[PDB]
Write a protein that binds this ligand. Structure first.
Ligand code: PC1
Ligand code: NDP
Lengths: 320, 104
């Protein structure tokens, strides 16, 4: 490893790890844990961003002095991309959206932007790379989010053949938009409208589990070029989950919002992913391979929805 | 009508500022926030009732200005002070009997 990146210290906050990580789209829900974990051990981190510098403030405590840098860039541009990746020991792409705008459609955020980043890393000779794909990727899939995603999984596997594409299932956490999606959006001011959520199988994963997986992947030398998917240890049915959620959230339940400016809620295409089944891929290595154990949704769902719980609950039945 | 329309507008306007103030900041996407987290003391109830009884006797005084127009003034003047003194005694009773504990 380069002379300045040799490990030093005991891995605390001010200890030097040697991982010069450049995170793209770190402002998101997933990124802030990856940044925080990278910051935890003091690894140098560069954080390009598009929003106001104000929105990046919460990342600052996560890193020691001179370990967090807030550049600027634009997906449509590659000159900016090169600067942020010129001397990175690894590059992580976390871009993505749950809805389409009039600037960047699904393909742009899921195909070109993941690619454009990949090529420059190859051009710059980045030694490693990480890419977050979706478990249910398939060009013949219904959900344009997935169909757009499925394209990206190919170029990234081509432009950067050694990039460790990862395909996690639904993720949940304190700031997640999945468990918080059902509790508030589905019910608030509106009776549940589940369209016979009886066939779907959902196998979400805990955000911390994903975060630990990524870091372990960076360290591993043999993880180069492989492909992983992260899935919770217990499968579930869509209908069973929602009903159980209202038990933890203690909201009234009755089994069975358009697209606008701002950040839309309950989008047309988002529905397809809720109903879309979680693929079963026994052959792809998963979390257990990375020295990471899946944390059951029972243990950690308590904290996320504790805030939803205004002011002794049998755990949800599983489906094989 | 006139008073009704005036009354309607006042509260009509009031709610809008309440609605707009409450709701319009909602559509501002300020991320999301985390979750934050009685002894019946005798002194406070005594004043509540004491106010009520003393207030009630006020209602008997309100006619006073109209009563002064009556040709039977000797009686009116006698009775008028009658209520006030009875009100005076009422307070006097509480004071001597230690009633005004909250005043302390
Ligand atoms: C009762 C009257 C009192 C007097 C008026 C008091 C002032 C209010 C009147 C002025 C309205 C100002 C609106 C902006 C106020 C909020 C500003 C703000 O915080 O911006 C954050 C947000 C920006 O969103 P954002 O994407 O940056 O937020 C998310 C960012 N993260 C996730 C990182 C937190 O502002 C807006 O969303 C825009 C608000 C509406 C803008 C008006 C657009 C009108 C034109 C639309 C059609 C155009 C067609 C072409
Ligand atoms: N819960 C899930 O969806 C799961 C996670 N994934 C993937 O993980 C990735 C990250 O997760 P998450 O943090 O919740 O996603 P986010 O919705 O929080 O967005 C991630 C980042 O992408 C940025 N972004 C949006 N548009 C652009 C753009 N044109 N150019 C540059 N940046 C842009 C966002 O910045 P800004 O806010 O300013 O737009 C944000 O910082 C996602 O891409 C997702 O595909 C895969 C399986 C399940």
């Amino acid at each position: 490893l380069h002379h300045a990146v040799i490990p030093h210290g005991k891995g605390g906050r001010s200890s030097v790890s040697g991982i010069v990580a450049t995170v793209f789209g770190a402002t998101g829900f997933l990124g802030r844990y990856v940044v925080n974990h990278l910051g935890r051990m003091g690894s140098q981190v560069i954080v390009p961003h598009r929003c106001e510098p104000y929105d990046t403030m919460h990342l600052r405590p996560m890193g020691d002095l001179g370990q967090i840098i807030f550049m600027d860039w634009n997906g449509r541009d590659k000159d900016s991309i090169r600067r942020a990746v010129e001397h990175s020991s690894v590059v992580i792409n976390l871009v993505g959206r749950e809805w389409e705008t009039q600037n960047f459609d699904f393909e742009d955020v899921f195909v070109k932007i993941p690619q454009a980043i990949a090529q420059v890393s190859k051009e710059a000779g980045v030694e490693k790379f990480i890419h977050i794909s979706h478990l249910n990727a398939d060009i013949k899939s219904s959900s344009k989010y997935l169909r757009s995603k499925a394209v990206g999984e190919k170029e990234v596997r081509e432009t950067f053949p050694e990039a460790t594409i990862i395909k996690p299932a639904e993720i949940f956490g304190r700031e997640d938009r999945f468990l918080n999606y059902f509790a508030n959006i589905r019910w608030f001011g509106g009776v549940p409208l589940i369209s016979l959520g009886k066939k779907t199988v959902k196998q979400p994963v805990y955000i911390v589990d994903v975060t630990k997986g990524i870091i372990n992947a960076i360290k591993d030398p043999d993880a180069r070029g492989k492909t992983f998917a992260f899935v919770g240890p217990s499968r579930y049915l869509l209908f069973d989950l929602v009903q159980y959620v209202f038990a933890v959230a203690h909201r009234p339940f009755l089994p069975y919002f358009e697209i606008s400016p701002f950040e839309p809620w309950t989008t047309r295409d988002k529905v397809e992913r809720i109903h879309t089944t979680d693929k079963i891929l026994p052959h792809l290595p998963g979390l257990e391979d990375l020295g990471v154990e899946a944390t059951p949704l029972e243990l950690k769902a308590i904290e996320v929805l504790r805030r939803h719980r205004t002011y002794d609950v049998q755990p949800a039945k599983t489906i094989p | 009508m006139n008073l009704m329309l005036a009354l309607l507008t006042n509260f009509t306007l009031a709610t809008l500022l309440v609605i707009i103030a409450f709701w319009l900041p909602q559509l501002n996407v300020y991320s999301e926030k985390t979750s934050p987290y009685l002894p019946f003391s005798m002194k406070f109830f005594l004043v509540a009732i004491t106010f009520l009884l003393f207030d009630l006797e006020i209602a008997l005084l309100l006619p006073l200005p109209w009563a002064s127009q009556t040709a039977n003034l000797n009686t009116m003047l006698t009775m008028a002070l009658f209520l006030i003194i009875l009100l005076a005694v009422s307070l006097a009773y509480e004071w001597t009997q230690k009633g005004l504990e909250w005043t302390e």
